[PDB]
Amino acid sequence: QLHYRLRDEQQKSLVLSDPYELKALHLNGQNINQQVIFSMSFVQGEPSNDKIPVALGLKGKNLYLSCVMKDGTPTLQLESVDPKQYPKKKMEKRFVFNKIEVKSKVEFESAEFPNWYISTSQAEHKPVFLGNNSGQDIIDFTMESV
């Protein structure tokens, strides 16, 4: 388990909001306290393309990012799991993200929904979602070790 904070290409930071939701907003050096710290771990997965399979959890919690078909669209969620079994090496496919490094920036493609990435909007206060890299969508992030 490696720990990190994520920031989008536009320098928005990630925070947790009440309803089990992640939002990206503009935060300064002073408001760094509020950002979500993620726990990254390697998952048994497959073939390269410069991609490493990982699971993303919330540090100190039995909460992990997931992708499921909901309302006839691939959706990102935060799922609760049994704290005695998680994390594991062989993570169920829905928790699997293909980490891609592109010039110093990182991209997180869903292993369950190829071509679907962890995204942020241009506006502030919007939730982080599963996108197909459609206009305005932001899919590149910077990772900072904790």
UniProtKB/Swiss-Prot annotation:
Induction conditions: By LPS.
Domain of life of the source: Eukaryota
Molecular-function GO term, any one: receptor ligand activity
Site positions for Important for interaction with integrin: 51, 59, 61, 70, 84
Keywords: Cytokine, Cytoplasm, Inflammatory response, Lysosome, Mitogen, Pyrogen, Secreted
Cellular component terms per the entry's GO annotation: cytosol; extracellular space; lysosome; secretory granule; vesicle
Tissue expression: Expressed in activated macrophages (at protein level).
Protein localization: Cytoplasm, Cytosol; Secreted; Lysosome; Secreted, Extracellular exosome
Biological processes annotated in GO: astrocyte activation; cellular response to interleukin-17; cellular response to mechanical stimulus; cellular response to xenobiotic stimulus; defense response to Gram-positive bacterium; ectopic germ cell programmed cell death; extrinsic apoptotic signaling pathway in absence of ligand; fever generation
Membrane-spanning ranges: none
Predominant cellular place of this UniProt entry's protein: cytoplasm
Function in brief: Potent pro-inflammatory cytokine. Initially discovered as the major endogenous pyrogen, induces prostaglandin synthesis, neutrophil influx and activation, T-cell activation and cytokine production, B-cell activation and antibody production, and fibroblast proliferation and collagen production. Promotes Th17 differentiation of T-cells. Synergizes with IL12/interleukin-12 to induce IFNG synthesis from T-helper 1 (Th1) cells. Plays a role in angiogenesis by inducing VEGF production synergistically with TNF and IL6.
Subunit text: Monomer. Interacts with MEFV. Interacts with integrins ITGAV:ITGBV and ITGA5:ITGB1; integrin-binding is required for IL1B signaling. Interacts with cargo receptor TMED10; the interaction is direct and is required for the secretion of IL1B mature form. Interacts with HSP90AB1; the interaction facilitates cargo translocation into the ERGIC. Interacts with HSP90B1; the interaction facilitates cargo translocation into the ERGIC.
Membership in a protein family: Belongs to the IL-1 family.
Misc: IL1B production occurs in 2 steps, each being controlled by different stimuli. First, inflammatory signals, such as LPS, stimulate the synthesis and promote the accumulation of cytosolic stores of pro-IL1B (priming). Then additional signals are required for inflammasome assembly, leading to CASP1 activation, pro-IL1B processing and eventually secretion of the active cytokine. IL1B processing and secretion are temporarily associated.
Protein name: Interleukin-1 beta
Organism from which the protein derives: Mus musculus
Protein encoded by which gene: Il1b
Residues of the full protein shown: 122 to 267 of 269
